Amino acid sequence: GPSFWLGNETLKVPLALFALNRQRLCERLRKNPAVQAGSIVVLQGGEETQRYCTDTGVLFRQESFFHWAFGVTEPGCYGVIDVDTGKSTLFVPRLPASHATWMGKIHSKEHFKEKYAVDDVQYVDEIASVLTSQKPSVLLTLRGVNTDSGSVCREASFDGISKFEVNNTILHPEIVECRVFKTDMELEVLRYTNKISSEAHREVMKAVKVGMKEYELESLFEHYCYSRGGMRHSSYTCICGSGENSAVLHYGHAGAPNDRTIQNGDMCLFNMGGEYYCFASDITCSFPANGKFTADQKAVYEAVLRSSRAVMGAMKPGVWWPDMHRLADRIHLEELAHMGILSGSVDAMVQAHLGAVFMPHGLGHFLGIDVHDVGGYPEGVERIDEPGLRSLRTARHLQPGMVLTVEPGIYFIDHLLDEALADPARASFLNREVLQRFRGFGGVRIEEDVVVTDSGIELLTCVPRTVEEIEACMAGCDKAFTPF
Amino acid sequence: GPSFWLGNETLKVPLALFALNRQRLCERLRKNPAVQAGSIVVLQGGEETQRYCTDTGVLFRQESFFHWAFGVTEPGCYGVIDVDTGKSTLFVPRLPASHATWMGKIHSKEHFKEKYAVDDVQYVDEIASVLTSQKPSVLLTLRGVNTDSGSVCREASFDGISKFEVNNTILHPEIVECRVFKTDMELEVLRYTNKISSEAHREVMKAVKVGMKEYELESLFEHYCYSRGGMRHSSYTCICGSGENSAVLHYGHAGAPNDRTIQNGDMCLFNMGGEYYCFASDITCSFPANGKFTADQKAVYEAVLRSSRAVMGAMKPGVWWPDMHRLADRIHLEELAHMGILSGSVDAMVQAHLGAVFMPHGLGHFLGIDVHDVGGYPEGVERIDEPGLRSLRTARHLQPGMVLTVEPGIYFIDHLLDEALADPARASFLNREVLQRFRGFGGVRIEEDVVVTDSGIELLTCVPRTVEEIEACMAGCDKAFTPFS
Numbered sequence A: 001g002p003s004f005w006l007g008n009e010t011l012k013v014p015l016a017l018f019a020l021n022r023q024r025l026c027e028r029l030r031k032n033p034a035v036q037a038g039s040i041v042v043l044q045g046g047e048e049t050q051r052y053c054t055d056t057g058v059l060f061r062q063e064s065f066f067h068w069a070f071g072v073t074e075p076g077c078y079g080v081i082d083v084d085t086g087k088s089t090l091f092v093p094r095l096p097a098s099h100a101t102w103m104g105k106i107h108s109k110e111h112f113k114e115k116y117a118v119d120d121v122q123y124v125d126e127i128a129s130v131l132t133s134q135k136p137s138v139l140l141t142l143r144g145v146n147t148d149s150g151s152v153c154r155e156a157s158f159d160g161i162s163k164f165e166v167n168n169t170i171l172h173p174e175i176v177e178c179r180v181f182k183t184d185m186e187l188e189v190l191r192y193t194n195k196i197s198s199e200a201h202r203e204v205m206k207a208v209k210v211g212m213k214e215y216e217l218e219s220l221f222e223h224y225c226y227s228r229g230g231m232r233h234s235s236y237t238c239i240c241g242s243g244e245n246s247a248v249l250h251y252g253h254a255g256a257p258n259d260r261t262i263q264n265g266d267m268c269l270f271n272m273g274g275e276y277y278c279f280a281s282d283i284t285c286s287f288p289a290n291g292k293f294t295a296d297q298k299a300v301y302e303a304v305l306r307s308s309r310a311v312m313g314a315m316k317p318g319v320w321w322p323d324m325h326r327l328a329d330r331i332h333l334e335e336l337a338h339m340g341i342l343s344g345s346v347d348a349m350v351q352a353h354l355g356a357v358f359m360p361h362g363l364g365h366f367l368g369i370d371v372h373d374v375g376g377y378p379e380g381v382e383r384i385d386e387p388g389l390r391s392l393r394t395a396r397h398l399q400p401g402m403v404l405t406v407e408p409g410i411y412f413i414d415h416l417l418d419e420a421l422a423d424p425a426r427a428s429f430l431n432r433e434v435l436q437r438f439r440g441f442g443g444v445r446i447e448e449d450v451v452v453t454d455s456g457i458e459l460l461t462c463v464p465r466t467v468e469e470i471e472a473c474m475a476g477c478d479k480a481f482t483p484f
Numbered sequence B: 001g002p003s004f005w006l007g008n009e010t011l012k013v014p015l016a017l018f019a020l021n022r023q024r025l026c027e028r029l030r031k032n033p034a035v036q037a038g039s040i041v042v043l044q045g046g047e048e049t050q051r052y053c054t055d056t057g058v059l060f061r062q063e064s065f066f067h068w069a070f071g072v073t074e075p076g077c078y079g080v081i082d083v084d085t086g087k088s089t090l091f092v093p094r095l096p097a098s099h100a101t102w103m104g105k106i107h108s109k110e111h112f113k114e115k116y117a118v119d120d121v122q123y124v125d126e127i128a129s130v131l132t133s134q135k136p137s138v139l140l141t142l143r144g145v146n147t148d149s150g151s152v153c154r155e156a157s158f159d160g161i162s163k164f165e166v167n168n169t170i171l172h173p174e175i176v177e178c179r180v181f182k183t184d185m186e187l188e189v190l191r192y193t194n195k196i197s198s199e200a201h202r203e204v205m206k207a208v209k210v211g212m213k214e215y216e217l218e219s220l221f222e223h224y225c226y227s228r229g230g231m232r233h234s235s236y237t238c239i240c241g242s243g244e245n246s247a248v249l250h251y252g253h254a255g256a257p258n259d260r261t262i263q264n265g266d267m268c269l270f271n272m273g274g275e276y277y278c279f280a281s282d283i284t285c286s287f288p289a290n291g292k293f294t295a296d297q298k299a300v301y302e303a304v305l306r307s308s309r310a311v312m313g314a315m316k317p318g319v320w321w322p323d324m325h326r327l328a329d330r331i332h333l334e335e336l337a338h339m340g341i342l343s344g345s346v347d348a349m350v351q352a353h354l355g356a357v358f359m360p361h362g363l364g365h366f367l368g369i370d371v372h373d374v375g376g377y378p379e380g381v382e383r384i385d386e387p388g389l390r391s392l393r394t395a396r397h398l399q400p401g402m403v404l405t406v407e408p409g410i411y412f413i414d415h416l417l418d419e420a421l422a423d424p425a426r427a428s429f430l431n432r433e434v435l436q437r438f439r440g441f442g443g444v445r446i447e448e449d450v451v452v453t454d455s456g457i458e459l460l461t462c463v464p465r466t467v468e469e470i471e472a473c474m475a476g477c478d479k480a481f482t483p484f485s
Ligand code: PRO
Pocket: A249, A250, A271, A361, A362, A365, A393, A407
């Protein structure tokens, strides 16, 4: 069958990937006792957008559920799936003649049918007529709440949909559940996104020099990913935190835009991941700007390396993700105590939620077509109302086929440290005089992407991780990849 | 005063630039008869967005009118200007404590006052109270139609605005008019955007090799612009058209995503422009993929070079922009005839609108904070209802301070050629035996950015342009070129 490919050494992604997703969705819907025979799934793709009121086009990136089902890159499409037969129909815009001048070839419907390996292709303006002739019992549309954004998924609509019976409740939990479990074809894509992003992280580690701006490495990362990987998009805005900025979890956005000069003695925390054909990667590397860990940097870094590998070593089916988060907290506390930042009973520190002062985010999250992938909190799975754990993006137990980030970190965040020092239940553990030295340190995060297997995990990421490996990487002369 | 700067060799942009824009807007409004004492201009900044229903943040780029007035890079702001006094107040979001963990320092209002050199800073939720205390006669908000997109500008609104008198008709044409005329401080920024984008285009010409994907050069261009220029955004999606894709005017979008392999013998048409602090650039370079122009390529290329230079030489205050478009059309037709593609009377060709077959877009457009900048068709300026000319993004007369692209091109577009061949009024001019050779050629576009001055123009762009200069650049021989004067 056909494949998506951006040539050179980029990955060929078979369109059969999306056919399998459609089949899996139908199989799941058929088993749902509420689903009527003759149902049709109706999804609406993303549309082209512009900046504000201008004609400045925004580069189009497909809506994630639509992509998962169809792999379609063009704006303005719809797609439907007959549940009982699995038959797929793509609806594409009927373009005006002037499109050939301004935008490119006006492809035939047959071109799209071949390209996407769907059963039929029709024009968008005929959607009501086509669906009417199919005589469906009900249209199943997409509406639900994303548990990371709190946004409501946009339900498909078209002129004449009011003449059909529409259900917008059944589909969302079923298609979400399908997305939670990655097929072998999807895993091949995620191995590739991890491979390219890993290579780009290594190039960044080799290129970092004291005196550079953070954004110079953002630029280099994205250039490697696009030119060598065919990754036109990143999975999220690059986080290139140097010095104290490494304590800011989503640093790099427009309000704090990777604009600090990297200084001798800084730690760097670079959390970046290219996106290929709407599939994510999400990797964090932490390292000294000057290529040599100080004693304090080594101690904090190796604490996080310890939790990283302890969590990865414990992960397997049946493990409760919140238990892995707590495992990381306990390790961090043990190590911070060894360093002299903390004193006293680690059991008591855990009871006082001290771990969350140093790791005020979730241990990690599902990853797929979105970096914070869907399905972390389906109905019946509750968010734990405690510091740190409440920021977990899933409280599920692990099962084969899930893809997770494993991203423990330790940070020195003044307002959290100050709150802890004011609370007698936590202050007794904190040694102010030692902690003082780490004010402004920033933090360390080590983030791998892994797949749960029948017996454990498969690690997708491949970057240097021990202190020696990182120092050796940064000292290498190779000068492969030299723009200009 | 304070400046925006991204360090290294990037441009320091004084925040005084935006203060001057506010002053100019107030000065214009004070002379406007529809404007009464005690009016306050109220603008709403852009807000943070995410991809669809996900939590994947989209990188925030400020709304252009708001940027022009305030230069503010943060999402969620509003800004007001007292017309009578010129006093400026910026409203910034009141952030949650958790912002300090996830997003960064929760800066004080005073930090923002100093950063932006405004007269006062307040929190957004206090806007109704703050405006109430000022007892304004009327709030002047933004609403109008963009003449390139057809979209309606987003008018400011806040909880309690219904208790004020609001006028949404006065402001738009006035702030648009201010934007049309660039200040010296704005020209400094546009000189810089052109400098960086020109350097990037030269790096791309040096790097292009047969067998590369078009997108490899998009990537290299954007990397030069960001890493060396501090340009986090491009002004528009890069157009990297090789071979027949060079005939597709806005090639490179998601439906045609710069994914062709460049072949020996192809022409390349690369239309790319970095954006710095929301100021545009827009440059097009055309060149042979293999670094050596064939005779046919040289002929088409030099025809567009001739029109480019003729227009730049004729541009000065008082010139009607559609007359420049017609000049380019006439030159293209003359040169296509000199190449044997066309024969007959060029006057007759012009009368039959044959130029538009080969250049089915406008000669050029205003440029500023938007690549297709505002104000090309103010009330009373009409679109010319002819092929080619109807795509002009302005029909105004040139005046000092305007910034224009000059972007003639010649393309070989099958459905347009075939229409002409089916039209007795046009068909006899075309020599099919020669034209057949140019089917699939794509096209050539040569685009400079210029400022209208008292004397003529100031050319902002600095890239190789003659065949000899381009061939030298591609061979690695950079800077071996002299700009037009
Ligand atoms: O948002 C999250 O869940 C993780 C935490 C560190 C950065 N990304």
